[PDB]
Enzyme design. Structure first.
Site, PDB file in Angstrom:
ATOM      1  CB  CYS A 197      -0.973  -0.012   1.183  1.00 41.87           C
ATOM      2  SG  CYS A 197      -0.135   0.048   2.808  1.00 41.87           S
ATOM      3  CG  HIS A 199      -5.033  -0.152   3.858  1.00 38.96           C
ATOM      4  ND1 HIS A 199      -4.007  -0.429   2.977  1.00 38.96           N
ATOM      5  CD2 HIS A 199      -6.145   0.012   3.101  1.00 38.96           C
ATOM      6  CE1 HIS A 199      -4.475  -0.421   1.741  1.00 38.96           C
ATOM      7  NE2 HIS A 199      -5.774  -0.166   1.789  1.00 38.96           N
ATOM      8  CB  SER A 223      -6.013  -3.076  -0.378  1.00 38.69           C
ATOM      9  OG  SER A 223      -6.462  -3.976   0.628  1.00 38.69           O
TER      10      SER A 223
HETATM   11  C1  LIG Z   1       0.137  -1.504   3.601  1.00 39.96           C
HETATM   12  C2  LIG Z   1      -0.566  -2.837   3.422  1.00 39.96           C
HETATM   13  O1  LIG Z   1      -0.018  -3.718   2.853  1.00 39.96           O
HETATM   14  N1  LIG Z   1      -1.887  -3.042   3.957  1.00 39.96           N
HETATM   15  C3  LIG Z   1      -2.503  -4.358   3.810  1.00 39.96           C
HETATM   16  C4  LIG Z   1      -3.145  -4.626   5.179  1.00 39.96           C
HETATM   17  C5  LIG Z   1      -3.871  -5.969   5.333  1.00 39.96           C
HETATM   18  C6  LIG Z   1      -5.259  -6.046   5.242  1.00 39.96           C
HETATM   19  C7  LIG Z   1      -5.912  -7.264   5.393  1.00 39.96           C
HETATM   20  C8  LIG Z   1      -5.168  -8.412   5.641  1.00 39.96           C
HETATM   21  O2  LIG Z   1      -5.803  -9.657   5.796  1.00 39.96           O
HETATM   22  C9  LIG Z   1      -3.785  -8.332   5.741  1.00 39.96           C
HETATM   23  C10 LIG Z   1      -3.132  -7.113   5.592  1.00 39.96           C
HETATM   24  C11 LIG Z   1      -3.556  -4.463   2.686  1.00 39.96           C
HETATM   25  O3  LIG Z   1      -4.443  -3.585   2.554  1.00 39.96           O
HETATM   26  O4  LIG Z   1      -3.571  -5.454   1.902  1.00 39.96           O
HETATM   27  C12 LIG Z   1       1.402  -1.755   4.426  1.00 39.96           C
HETATM   28  O5  LIG Z   1       2.052  -2.874   3.886  1.00 39.96           O
HETATM   29  C13 LIG Z   1       2.376  -0.569   4.405  1.00 39.96           C
HETATM   30  O6  LIG Z   1       3.193  -0.499   3.530  1.00 39.96           O
HETATM   31  O7  LIG Z   1       2.319   0.409   5.421  1.00 39.96           O
HETATM   32  C14 LIG Z   1       1.099   0.532   6.107  1.00 39.96           C
HETATM   33  C15 LIG Z   1       1.240   1.630   7.158  1.00 39.96           C
END
Ligand SMILES: *[C@@H](C(=O)N[C@@H](Cc1ccc(O)cc1)C(=O)O)[C@@H](O)C(=O)OCC
Ligand SMILES: [Cl-]
EC number: 3.4.17.17
Lengths: 247, 26
Positions: free
Chosen positions: A111, A146, A163
């Site tokens: 993200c 997120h 996401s």
């Molecule tokens: C951003 C990121 O990858 N968010 C993930 C969160 C997530 C949602 C639902 C599940 O089951 C697992 C993980 C997404 O939306 O897919 C994060 O990696 C980043 O770079 O910094 C966030 C502050």
């Protein structure tokens, strides 16, 4: 939990081995995944996604669709290793250098990388405003974080991002208020059994890719459960008003 | 370019791996 590549590209020996050691732990097959891929000479040649460019006659919402399609083509990064290090306090010009490298090297992303790319790819759109929106949610005794890129076009609100869930990233710029956009995200989280706890709203980001200013990720921080529904809306609309007035 | 070659070889393994890990995280 994720490892971050901090040596640039190509990935150095230690970071590359760490990535495969991580895969062997997580994947039930473990070592056989690495055995099949590492050193394989018949692997698919993945096309480098074409960076979108726009004629001046293409409407901005159509440009945003193309930017999101580009972000999606890179694919969500499920490897366990993040290939670009993102220091969120960097001057914008350094984050824009990184975004350029992301388009040149064309690796999977998550993200935060997507937010930086969305800025990079919309700096050519002065009639669009871009501001980060961050979420903190709760599921099954754990917190999740997120981030998406809020956008504002012609008085409407939308979002770009990446996401693993379809309804937690792209939103066409059709929402009449910032409140309606954020409440849509809250409902999408509810549908996958996450409780929204916090929303953090940034300020608008310069369209100058050589700007030395920092992105302001956490200008407004909203405690959703404490504010309650009516003051939640009120605060969201206050952030939106400030942004518009400041422009 | 040796560096370019490394990056192309690595990118192919990264996307092959990402397909496997994506199939796992469904
Ligand atoms: C951003 C990121 O990858 N968010 C993930 C969160 C997530 C949602 C639902 C599940 O089951 C697992 C993980 C997404 O939306 O897919 C994060 O990696 C980043 O770079 O910094 C966030 C502050
Ligand atoms: Cl927090």
């Amino acid at each position: 939990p994720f490892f971050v590549n901090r040596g640039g590209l190509p990935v150095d020996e230690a970071t590359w081995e760490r990535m495969w050691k991580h895969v062997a732990k997580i994947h039930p097959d473990g070592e056989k995944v690495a055995q099949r891929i590492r050193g394989a000479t018949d692997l698919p040649k993945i096309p480098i996604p074409s960076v979108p460019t726009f004629q001046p006659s293409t409407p901005v919402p159509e440009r945003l669709e193309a930017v999101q399609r580009y972000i999606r083509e890179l694919q969500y990064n499920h490897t366990g290793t993040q290939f670009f290090e993102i220091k969120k306090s960097r001057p914008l010009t350094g984050l824009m250098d990184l975004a350029k490298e992301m388009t040149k090297e064309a690796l999977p992303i998550k993200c935060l990388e997507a937010v930086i790319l969305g800025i990079y790819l919309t700096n050519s759109m002065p009639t669009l405003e871009r501001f980060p929106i961050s979420f903190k949610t709760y599921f099954s005794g754990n917190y999740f974080r997120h981030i998406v890129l809020g956008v504002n076009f012609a008085g409407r609100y939308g979002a770009l991002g990446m996401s693993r869930r379809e309804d937690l990233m792209y939103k066409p710029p059709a929402f009449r208020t910032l409140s309606e956009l954020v409440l849509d995200f809250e409902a999408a989280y509810g549908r996958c059994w996450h409780v929204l706890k916090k929303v953090k709203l940034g300020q608008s980001v310069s369209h100058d890719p050589h700007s030395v200013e920092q992105i302001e990720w956490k200008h407004s921080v909203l405690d959703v459960e404490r504010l309650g529904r009516d003051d939640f809306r009120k605060e969201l609309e206050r952030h939106a008003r400030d942004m518009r007035l400041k422009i | 370019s040796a560096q370019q070659e490394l990056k192309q070889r690595q990118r192919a393994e990264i996307y092959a791996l990402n397909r496997v890990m994506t199939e796992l995280e469904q």
